[PDB]
């Protein structure tokens, strides 16, 4: 049961012994470029650190085994990090994104705690036995804030300080210690921001700070050393090591620094996801980002309706909620060049086209179960038949409308021609039609056809130049498309009649659009905007979000109605067909086949030759 | 009519001035009886003892920038999340007024810096209000000698520690300075800047083109190449050099000045621009130049978009046609930058497209084959008006070059501090965050600090040092001026010139290629620079050995070397002796003591009660800390208690070796001088009396206060006595340091013994200074023939071995020439006649690199015996007799002008210029004059085979003007208050130090009929209304 | 009978024959050359092209063997020499002899 001192310096997490104060060894870790915030766990003797050059937070034991990245997306530059050894949680403060967030110890169930009016949080300290989390801010007005470990009751604890760092709690004396970089001193205070006392002065830049027994340790970048002193008086001043320049964070490694208890206990407080400590040693059950707490106030629920907007190397998700919750990045690996997106509301899998790999890949929302559906070929846009469970995707290299199952089993080609150039495509299985843009030169067309390639007809051909995106909404019975050359967004009924222009101003490069309730969202790559127009016409064009580079596609997802889906005839056993099952207007259900096959005499299976 | 007998008597006058009045015969016996130690060294041991010194000076200096690197390296990995979010400034702060250390400016330096605002300042996230002060103050306190510390961010805020006010008259843009351009992009740029005047470019539109063309040249470095071209019906480059019309010349200080005056000298023409021929010549220049080590090549074009009448896109065809053929012939290495000169709309939107296609080299638009299989370097295009910042737009062309992520320290050559002080040497290294650039850090140090161990080398009397680099540029050599005195030095000087000597180019090979080594060579005595002749230790030699030992300065691109003349002959230095001071030691700082009955001796604080002693900057363990830091009364007492310390209890307060030993060996002059003063009859003729040593000791009587930076080892009387061992050396007339005006000096060397009387065995010289008219008062009293008439047609005169007259009937004149005291201006006919006597007059051309000039001077044969009379000229109208004064370097001569004769020697009365700086003739008479340069700024050699043994060894020695102060000038009288107007005849006023014999009235040439003696303040040079020589 | 010019300064100037004594009481071309060569720096600096022609017309005057008449030259050679060279002569130690004033 020995206490050491862990500190970070460049790419090294170096360890100093406090008894035989001579052992200087480094923690056996590889791949670290720059180490920053430090904290550990008393249960399994893990060491946790933040890497602000790789934008990751990684974890491992004291031997380098089980080296893993628990937080790897959505980080800018976080040097605030602390461990909840009781509730088995992780908190961190990111300065670039201005967010104090939360997740489990393995990196799952990511939730944002503080995202409003937060100006660069840094040093983070935790008091889980009492239910408080303390952190520092610089920026405009440097101050030290207080809040519960769930994001509520945020208060300004110490208003008049300089740029502070190295926030450490002495859990025995009920006091809070911190350094000050502008007034050049180290000072203390009780657990509620007052009774402030300066311990030592004339430190031109005390960056790090920690506490153990009657001794506080700090590092000053001017003196290039780690020092020890009496925690309350400042006497008995000794040097631990010299020639150590620019330590990013120091930490006392001992089991008494992480004692106490709370009501989360060993059963996670019987919460489904997160156990977040609140006053009176109590707890509340937290939920990941965009999840809501149910009525029982112990279980969480995923969002039933939400929107997905993608970038070149990142897929995002935002909800319209009255909490005004922020959007998050979906932890999907190997995202390279996403061109278009679509979502399956049944098995909760997100699909996309990576134009640098020429692949159609799928994965869960949390990143697991990554699978390549299609892998020369050059996909461009996709639209999912969520009923029959099969995908329509257009290939720009062969200029065909090709059909592929969700598992990757090829079905066949339903549309091909010498002059045809199918690009954007959206399906409407509720009525048995598919819509697609036909980008023939100097004669662009918007056509439609049945789900097998026959019954082809041209809907609109005039008034078009570069129809680059397509979408529809079966409830409203409307077809929407954006023109990046004429700079306008238009509308029309699902039969070709009632063609109107919804907006033709302040449009530059609309590469995507979708319908969410009575709102038409679209994305502008050049203007870097997500905006919306009310279809009812009572409200005006409203800005949603700015500062989003490399926009590609957007897709809204409504909750899947259990009764409406199963009452579709092709939903069960694909309607008994071997390939294509399409709804016909006369109320009956008919099987069909691609263009290189013929429907056999049983009117269920297909044949060749 | 005799002349030899008059020379024996006038020579006994010289010995009485040296033996009795100065004490040479006594001090030669005192140093003859002292015991010395001996060394025989080939330079192998001394080279690594001195390489041991400066290598640790560079290691501590590299450990500052490697520190300040890991400072800023950690100052982004932390400040990507711990930024400033604050604002400060570099002015509006009225304390300071300290001028401490090298920072001779207002400087608080209470661990606080400042932030100089650029124009491209926004929000972003960088240096935390320079919270770096935490470490910056530690750096300044823990490493004395360093000067400035600064950080120029990529954003543009210029932050420097410590804080001072340095040109708040505009904006201090550092990203467009030569410091920050050659550091982030250390590769050599081959730039040509093409200017567009003509096609009726307006004057405000031309004013932007000439201001921006002068921001580019003020931002590059000499390892680059530049050639600016003008284009208007014809292409004419700078018409000020030969290789400007052929090659690209490096961008030194001399090329920047010529190329910028060729700017603003061009005014708007009217013919069509003629674009295509302007680019075809810029490639013909880049082609002819060498590649020489990593090179990028760029062309900048400053136009407004010019068309003709029916050749608007046809001449556009011809421009992008030669861009494909010429740049394709160069493997597409050239990059093209274009800047538009728009104002009010004179340049439309279509002429912007013509300057777009030039930067991108968009040749396929105008139908060109473009058979260049290799891609083209895509250039940029920027717009300008009279409101744009020309430092952040045109000055930032270097961001368009490939950044190869070079992370190596770059060492700069000395340059003037842009912050309001003298000379600086700066090393800088870029700063990377993975692949994101941050800016650079830089540590400024005084040039005198880096070189203090090689500029003040006083170990052996047989050796001297010099510092070089890889390609041979001399950073220091005894032929250069001390770094502390300079204003802007010409570093562009190879050692093949300073150490020019036959068979030196063979040793120059092994020094630049081998890390270390040693080597001896044999050189004849004649055809050798003086530094080797002043250190010979065998009498009567025809050739001599020299040993060179060199070694690289580790972890940098510099090389040190030790020169030892005659390594086999033992060199002696004074053994440690401990004589008790018979007369107590008085340090020369009389302003800090004030205890003696003080008085004023010319422009000096002095005393007549006891002589003083001086320690030059070279005597201390740290010469820079003695020159920059003030010297307090406490420092004088530690030095006085240690120099006269007969015991060995007082520790060394900061002196070198052999410093206290040469003070205890020369303390015997205090008894000689005080005894002679009271029994001498020349108390009113001698202005002072002094002795000097090579290790920096200077004893003077009357003991006077001198400037701290005064070095007697660099004066002419000292350098002239060592060249003539044992002989009495007459030096002058020369301007005295103590403000005594023009004086004449008798100097003589004293040796370790007497069995060995060579130049190298000189351990000290003695000197005694007289007045200008004294030696003409001696000729009239000693030699009766001179008084036959009043110095009109029968004139007597004394000449030194350089041609100057220390005694002459006429004194001072149309207030000119400058070299008026030379024989060529006062006696023209003798000069033409003595140039014809063979083996007696030698004209010398030495090369002085200090002020980039070549000096002319005469050297008379000091070993002549017998008379010299008229041989060809002056056979009728002007008889002459010239002979040598025995045992000295002076000559006595008489002229008998019996009939008028007209003779001329060209001597400038406005400058010093020679008439003809093309050739030099032996028989062409002209007073000592100069010629600028005989080199070429193209290859770096001598135009003619001017491998003369040169090195005039500065010998210019920039005369200062250190006065005293008002209010104290009138509170004291003259020391020797020799009341002037109580002297009656000319024989009693000539030679008195603060008097002068007034012969001319206050109006030119009016002989006043009552010549009286007066304080010299009244009548200067004889005219009672004449103005000051100063 | 005239003798040919022997001073190297005044050879190949337009005429070959001169006769001593001249205007400055020089008895031989040897003695006349010793003074005129004191102007040799001015001739090689090329201030006025008329300088060698003007100076040599003074020290080594034209001699015709059986002519012996005083046919005059032309003052224009005197005032072109002093036009371009006098500002440079006064700059250094040179000064015109009074026997060479452009009025004679
Ligand atoms: C990359 C590749 O070959 N993919 C094949 C494709 O060629 C073929 O059309 C399809 C069914 O025939 O199966 C898949
Ligand atoms: C700290 O200072 C107090 C002064 O009141 C002293 O009593 C105590 O022993 C000190 N602690 C240590 C560890 O020296
Ligand atoms: C909701 O939370 C409260 C805590 O204030 C708890 O008492 C209550 O039981 C929860 N709701 C239900 C339905 O249990
Ligand atoms: C359509 O499907 C496969 C993938 O399932 C695709 O690779 C191929 O190019 C197409 N094949 C046919 C027969 O159309
Ligand atoms: C002195 O210089 C002359 C110059 O020609 C040379 O011939 C002679 O050898 C030199 N004397 C030596 C080398 O002893
Ligand atoms: C050069 O040195 C050698 C010994 O190394 C010596 O014998 C010779 O006399 C010297 N030559 C000189 C001094 O000219
Ligand atoms: C010049 O001096 C040298 C040696 O110093 C001597 O040999 C020579 O004879 C001297 N010439 C005359 C003309 O005195
Ligand atoms: C020297 O000058 C004197 C007077 O000026 C004169 O009497 C004497 O004849 C001269 N000597 C000559 C001409 O040899
Ligand atoms: C000039 O001298 C250098 C040696 O410093 C030499 O390399 C170069 O060739 C010379 N230039 C010529 C000979 O044109």
Residue numbers in the entry:
A (entry chain C): 630 to 1004, 1013 to 1246
B (entry chain A): 53 to 344, 349 to 869, 872 to 1088
C (entry chain B): 32 to 135
Provide text from the study.
These studies identify Cachd1 as a conserved Wnt receptor-interacting protein that regulates lateralized neuronal identity in the zebrafish brain. Biochemical and structural analyses demonstrated that Cachd1 can bind simultaneously to Lrp6 and Frizzled family Wnt co-receptors.
Guided by our in vitro measurements, we attempted cocrystallization of CACHD1ECD with FZD5CRD and LRP6P3E3P4E4. There are three ternary complexes in an asymmetric unit (ASU). However, the CACHD1 structure reveals an addition to the C-terminal region of the ECD that does not show any homology to known structures in PDB by Dali search. This region interfaces with FZD5CRD and we therefore term it the FZD interaction (FZI) domain. The two α helices of the N-terminal dCache domain (C-1) interact with the LRP6P3 propeller. Thus, CACHD1 serves as a cross-linking component in the ternary complex, independently binding to FZD5CRD and LRP6P3E3P4E4. Functional studies have indicated that LRP6P3E3P4E4 harbors the primary binding site for WNT3A and also for the C-terminal domain of DKK-1 (DKK-1C), an inhibitor that competes with Wnts for binding to LRP5/6 (23).
